[PDB]
Design an enzyme around this catalytic site. Structure first.
Site, PDB file in Angstrom:
ATOM      1  N   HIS A  22      -5.439   7.575  -2.197  1.00 10.59           N
ATOM      2  CA  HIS A  22      -6.444   6.585  -1.765  1.00 10.59           C
ATOM      3  C   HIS A  22      -7.587   6.511  -2.778  1.00 10.59           C
ATOM      4  O   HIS A  22      -8.041   7.541  -3.295  1.00 10.59           O
ATOM      5  CB  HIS A  22      -6.975   6.871  -0.364  1.00 10.59           C
ATOM      6  CG  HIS A  22      -5.937   6.741   0.707  1.00 10.59           C
ATOM      7  ND1 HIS A  22      -5.832   7.632   1.753  1.00 10.59           N
ATOM      8  CD2 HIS A  22      -4.944   5.836   0.882  1.00 10.59           C
ATOM      9  CE1 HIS A  22      -4.825   7.279   2.530  1.00 10.59           C
ATOM     10  NE2 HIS A  22      -4.264   6.191   2.023  1.00 10.59           N
ATOM     11  N   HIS A  41       1.557   4.478  -2.801  1.00  5.95           N
ATOM     12  CA  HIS A  41       1.737   5.925  -2.719  1.00  5.95           C
ATOM     13  C   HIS A  41       2.993   6.353  -3.478  1.00  5.95           C
ATOM     14  O   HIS A  41       2.925   7.248  -4.325  1.00  5.95           O
ATOM     15  CB  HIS A  41       1.774   6.425  -1.272  1.00  5.95           C
ATOM     16  CG  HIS A  41       0.445   6.366  -0.574  1.00  5.95           C
ATOM     17  ND1 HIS A  41      -0.703   6.921  -1.099  1.00  5.95           N
ATOM     18  CD2 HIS A  41       0.090   5.838   0.624  1.00  5.95           C
ATOM     19  CE1 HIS A  41      -1.706   6.726  -0.260  1.00  5.95           C
ATOM     20  NE2 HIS A  41      -1.252   6.074   0.793  1.00  5.95           N
ATOM     21  N   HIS A  48       0.843  -1.218   0.000  1.00  6.81           N
ATOM     22  CA  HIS A  48       0.000   0.000   0.000  1.00  6.81           C
ATOM     23  C   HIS A  48       0.867   1.253   0.000  1.00  6.81           C
ATOM     24  O   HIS A  48       0.663   2.156  -0.818  1.00  6.81           O
ATOM     25  CB  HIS A  48      -0.958  -0.005   1.213  1.00  6.81           C
ATOM     26  CG  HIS A  48      -1.712   1.280   1.422  1.00  6.81           C
ATOM     27  ND1 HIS A  48      -3.030   1.438   1.051  1.00  6.81           N
ATOM     28  CD2 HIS A  48      -1.344   2.450   1.997  1.00  6.81           C
ATOM     29  CE1 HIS A  48      -3.434   2.655   1.372  1.00  6.81           C
ATOM     30  NE2 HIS A  48      -2.433   3.290   1.952  1.00  6.81           N
ATOM     31  N   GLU A  49       1.836   1.296   0.913  1.00  6.10           N
ATOM     32  CA  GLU A  49       2.756   2.429   1.004  1.00  6.10           C
ATOM     33  C   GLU A  49       3.550   2.672  -0.279  1.00  6.10           C
ATOM     34  O   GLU A  49       3.741   3.817  -0.685  1.00  6.10           O
ATOM     35  CB  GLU A  49       3.726   2.251   2.177  1.00  6.10           C
ATOM     36  CG  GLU A  49       3.094   2.341   3.549  1.00  6.10           C
ATOM     37  CD  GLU A  49       2.223   3.561   3.705  1.00  6.10           C
ATOM     38  OE1 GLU A  49       2.614   4.652   3.240  1.00  6.10           O
ATOM     39  OE2 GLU A  49       1.129   3.415   4.266  1.00  6.10           O
TER      40      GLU A  49
HETATM   41  C1  LIG Z   1      -3.729  10.640  10.202  1.00  6.45           C
HETATM   42  C2  LIG Z   1      -2.406  11.253   9.815  1.00  6.45           C
HETATM   43  C3  LIG Z   1      -2.341  11.655   8.349  1.00  6.45           C
HETATM   44  C4  LIG Z   1      -2.407  10.493   7.367  1.00  6.45           C
HETATM   45  C5  LIG Z   1      -1.328  10.554   6.316  1.00  6.45           C
HETATM   46  C6  LIG Z   1      -1.462   9.575   5.145  1.00  6.45           C
HETATM   47  C7  LIG Z   1      -0.995   8.173   5.554  1.00  6.45           C
HETATM   48  C8  LIG Z   1      -1.273   7.103   4.520  1.00  6.45           C
HETATM   49  O1  LIG Z   1      -2.240   7.146   3.777  1.00  6.45           O
HETATM   50  N1  LIG Z   1      -0.387   6.128   4.514  1.00  6.45           N
HETATM   51  O2  LIG Z   1      -0.547   5.084   3.609  1.00  6.45           O
HETATM   52  C9  LIG Z   1      -0.558  10.108   4.048  1.00  6.45           C
HETATM   53  O3  LIG Z   1       0.650  10.135   4.217  1.00  6.45           O
HETATM   54  N2  LIG Z   1      -1.116  10.615   2.917  1.00  6.45           N
HETATM   55  C10 LIG Z   1      -2.511  10.701   2.431  1.00  6.45           C
HETATM   56  C11 LIG Z   1      -2.711   9.594   1.396  1.00  6.45           C
HETATM   57  C12 LIG Z   1      -1.799  10.050   0.247  1.00  6.45           C
HETATM   58  C13 LIG Z   1      -1.276  11.414   0.738  1.00  6.45           C
HETATM   59  C14 LIG Z   1      -2.480  11.935   1.530  1.00  6.45           C
HETATM   60  C15 LIG Z   1      -0.253  11.152   1.860  1.00  6.45           C
HETATM   61  C16 LIG Z   1       0.400  12.503   2.206  1.00  6.45           C
HETATM   62  O4  LIG Z   1       0.016  13.171   3.167  1.00  6.45           O
HETATM   63  N3  LIG Z   1       1.388  12.882   1.364  1.00  6.45           N
HETATM   64  C17 LIG Z   1       2.083  14.097   1.474  1.00  6.45           C
HETATM   65  N4  LIG Z   1       1.360  15.188   1.178  1.00  6.45           N
HETATM   66  C18 LIG Z   1       2.005  16.366   1.265  1.00  6.45           C
HETATM   67  C19 LIG Z   1       3.336  16.452   1.634  1.00  6.45           C
HETATM   68  N5  LIG Z   1       4.072  15.363   1.930  1.00  6.45           N
HETATM   69  C20 LIG Z   1       3.454  14.198   1.849  1.00  6.45           C
HETATM   70  O5  LIG Z   1       4.065  13.028   2.116  1.00  6.45           O
HETATM   71  C21 LIG Z   1       5.412  13.082   2.584  1.00  6.45           C
HETATM   72 ZN   LIG Z   2      -2.404   5.324   2.514  1.00  7.20          ZN
END
Ligand SMILES: CCCCC[C@H](CC(=O)NO)C(=O)N1[C@@H]2CC[C@@H](C2)[C@H]1C(=O)Nc1nccnc1OC
Ligand SMILES: [Zn+2]
Ligand SMILES: [Zn+2]
Length: 200
Positions: free
Chosen positions: A103, A97, A93-94
């Protein structure tokens, strides 16, 4: 929910990586198995980072925030792996990303496929259910994938385990489709990942 931005797509499907310290050998093997799983079904490739600017860092720390979607570029990007999120399917899953998938439940077309039960979301976590704005995603003609490794479970971020936050809107082959599987890449995940990286 594949990223619309071609700059977040890793050049030639080549993702450089580093496995950090403080992992057991068993954990290190799981990361390798997860990366291999992506390599097997798609044209994406994971290679030990040498002198690249852009790479992923498996980092031993608490689960959750944050996994950059796609190639950030001009430096490393971390994958948080802790005690409660170190299993193969969660790591796959990770890496979903990493290659550039948001998602599945945040697709701009998601309201045709799932209902979001707002009243059951943990207060302060509702932002996790916001749709991606339409300019951020390109589905590449692929249908909403209930079986995606990127799809939330029925009770993700729920006030309680017996309260659903996400409810599929229609039956698929006789029954409401299960969501939230963390076993393997879906037929849909592969098909769509192959399209995003122009795989033969
Ligand atoms: C509850 C705390 C926040 C949850 C953060 C999720 C965790 C996830 O889904 N892990 O599998 C995430 O990291 N996400 C969400 C799903 C894809 C995007 C949004 C990612 C994220 O926040 N990415 C970033 N966005 C902006 C800046 N830096 C990022 O990652 C380093
Ligand atoms: Zn995720
Ligand atoms: Zn999908």
């Amino acid at each position: 929910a594949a990223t619309s931005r071609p700059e977040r797509v890793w050049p030639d499907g080549v993702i450089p990586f580093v496995i950090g310290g403080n992992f057991t050998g068993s954990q290190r093997a799981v990361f390798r198995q997860a990366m291999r799983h992506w390599e097997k079904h798609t044209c994406v490739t994971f290679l030990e980072r040498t002198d690249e600017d852009s790479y992923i860092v498996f980092t031993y720390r608490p689960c959750g925030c944050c996994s950059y979607v796609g190639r950030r570029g001009g430096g490393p990007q971390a994958i948080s792996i802790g005690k409660n999120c170190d299993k193969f399917g969660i790591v796959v899953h990770e890496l979903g990303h990493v290659v550039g998938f948001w998602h599945e439940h945040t697709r701009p077309d998601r309201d045709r496929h799932v209902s979001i039960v707002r009243e059951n979301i943990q207060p302060g976590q509702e932002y996790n259910f916001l749709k991606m704005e339409p300019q951020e995603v390109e589905s590449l003609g692929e249908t909403y994938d209930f079986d995606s490794i990127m799809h939330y479970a029925r009770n993700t971020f729920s006030r309680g385990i017996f309260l659903d936050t996400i409810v599929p809107k229609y039956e698929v082959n006789g029954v409401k489709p299960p969501i939230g599987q963390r076993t393997r890449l879906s037929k849909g995940d592969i098909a769509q990942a192959r399209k995003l990286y122009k795989c033969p």
